[PDB]
């Protein structure tokens, strides 16, 4: 497996999963989100003001589905 680590741009949508996130600050970039199991879950979008980073691949941030199709 691998980590995404993408740092978000100003105005960029970010996605948490209300079902799987360990904390509400755990998020995925749109590419990882759309490649993840969480696209079928109760997701929550927060817009980045510039900064923050994608937690795809962080096995401590997600109760299930820590990776997306791209990073698995």
């Amino acid at each position: 497996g691998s980590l995404c680590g993408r740092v978000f741009k100003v105005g960029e949508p970010t996605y948490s999963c209300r079902d799987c996130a360990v904390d509400p600050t755990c998020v995925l970039c749109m590419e990882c989100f759309l490649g993840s199991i969480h696209r079928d879950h109760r997701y929550r979008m927060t817009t980045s003001g510039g900064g923050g980073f994608c937690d795809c691949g962080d096995t401590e941030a997600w109760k299930e589905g820590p990776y997306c199709q791209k990073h698995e």
Binding site: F8, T25, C26, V27, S48, G49, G51, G52
Partner: peptide, 4 residues
């Protein structure tokens, strides 16, 4: 992670 992100923080508003």
């Amino acid at each position: 992670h992100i923080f508003s």
